[PDB]
Amino acid sequence: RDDNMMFITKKMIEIRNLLQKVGQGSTVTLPSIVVIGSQSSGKSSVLEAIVGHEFLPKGSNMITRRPIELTLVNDPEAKVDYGEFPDLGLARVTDFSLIQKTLTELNQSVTDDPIRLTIHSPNIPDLSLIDLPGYILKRKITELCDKYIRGPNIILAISAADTDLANSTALQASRRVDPRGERTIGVITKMDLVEPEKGAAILSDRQYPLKLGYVGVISKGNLLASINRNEKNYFGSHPTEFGPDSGVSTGVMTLRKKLLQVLEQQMSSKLNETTEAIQRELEETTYQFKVQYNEQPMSAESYLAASLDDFKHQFHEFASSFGRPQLQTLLKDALDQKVLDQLAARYWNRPIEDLSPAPREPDNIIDLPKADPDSPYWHRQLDTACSGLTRLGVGRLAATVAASAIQQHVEKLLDKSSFAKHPSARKVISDAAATVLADRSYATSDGIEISLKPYKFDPDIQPNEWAQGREHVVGVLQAELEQCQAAMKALENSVGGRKKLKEVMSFVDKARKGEIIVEGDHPSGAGGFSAALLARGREAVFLRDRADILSLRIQAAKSRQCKTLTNKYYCPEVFLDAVATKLAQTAVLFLNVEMLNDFYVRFPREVEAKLHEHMHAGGGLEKFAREDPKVRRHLDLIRRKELLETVLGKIEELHRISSG
């Protein structure tokens, strides 16, 4: 008739689960029933726990590496037998076969954390037992068991009637950690297959007595009531031995009632000291919240928003920094390299292989200053050079160059930004920039080609542009010369002595004249030189000839005859650089408007949308907060304080219920 006892035990198991949810070792907890049993005694254990409420998944092949915190609720007003998982909150399971597949899947998965469980049934009384592995690597299981039983939990030991009592590791360890036998109750299972003379012997024992006594039961829809009826009728077979007025106590209902009483008593006793300790740790947590974070509230979404605004301000400063002259230098450099490409491909020497060269005799690159001004060869050469340079993918070159530049700045800005950690969000940002630039790339390119269409027809060069082209050509050409000489010296140091590479140069020059010819029947050795030495000699001769042409053409570009633009066909370098600079600058105008400005406008919106879709689609906002240690400690402190507050509230409500 102790409905109020039922309610008070319910409130206390609730507050226990709350304390468990503030964390392990981060607070004091309330006791509960710990069950232990030997191999046979533990099969009878899991079977006992089954029949203690209703059929649930146990046994079979179990790792038992993780305990199972069963928290039961008295379930009036609900007419369906449903059990739910707290970690998978708000998810209910109707059939315990699904619970079978789930918790046995957690079994096969195997941290040492115990899985919590909650089951509601009107038949079952609210309780709080935890099932750890039964005794049978095996040293570790006994370590965890010992650790669990040493603390003042109400330990529930089971023992099969077949095994001797002094042989059961369940009762033996029960007596190991509890010599008085004051906080342990015993259950003798599989008791149907013994004589009731054994029943009185095992259940009523003076060899290893204990308070709370032993309780013998035979454990094995409507399975609860079925096992109940079996308990009621089995004892009619031998009523005088274990029946009314017999000292022993049996059946499942009595075991459950006793469990409720003992749990209520032990828990209620520890309740006062636990309560005082919780009040202390709430005081301390509040103190740390004041001193270290100045009581500043924090949420994951707040962190994400603030850091995103920081990144946006940083990007704004960058965009104010970037502008158009940077594009000017970038494009003008790329077109410098293109000018070099054209001049080499149309005027200068080629790569080197063993076959002797075609003569190219009628006109040569060095007679250019003193050649016929009306020369069809030179006219055609400079004209096809300019046509080739202009009718090149200058649009796609500008688009891809500006794209790589912007993306590089975005990744660097990210490196210095608040998104240094959280690599997932960082990748979302970078990929957003990449997709915006990719979207604008084609339109930028095609538009640049259209804007260049009039300079493709007549890129008329003004004298000032010509002088600019002269000054720039000198620097570009001389820089290329220095690169050639550096690669030459590197070739010398690579091959060995300068004299050796000079010898291989003599051989390659000999093969380049008529003085010697070689056939390709043996591609391993030609001359007194190896195949690799020969290849390196070819590259060395190429570098030599290109270097000589380069210095000669630098002197020619510095000549007085190149001062005026009227002999453009005599000075292709300066002319091509003038064309390159002009194309570069007008392409830079169109690029800056179209691609750059579209990036400055679309980039923040794309960041916002893709980040939202990531954080809300992946549930990755909470993990995003978890990634940074400082904010993780901050949110952990806030959650801890809130949890302790709600716990104290429940305790005060309970104390109100039992005081008035």
Swiss-Prot record:
State the residue spans of region: G4 motif: 189-192
Q: List the disulfide bonds.
A: C562-C571
Region G1 motif, as annotated, extends over 37-44
The signal sequence is: none
Quick one: where's region G5 motif? 218-220
Which segments carry the region annotation G3 motif? 131-134
Source domain of life is: Eukaryota
Domain (GED): residue spans on this chain: 565-659
UniProt subcellular location: Mitochondrion intermembrane space
Under what name is this protein listed?
A: Dynamin-like GTPase MGM1, small form
Q: Which organism is it from?
A: Chaetomium thermophilum (strain DSM 1495 / CBS 144.50 / IMI 039719)
**Highest lineage ranks of the organism?**
Eukaryota, Fungi, Dikarya, Ascomycota, Pezizomycotina
- Within the intact protein, the region shown is 223 to 910 of 939
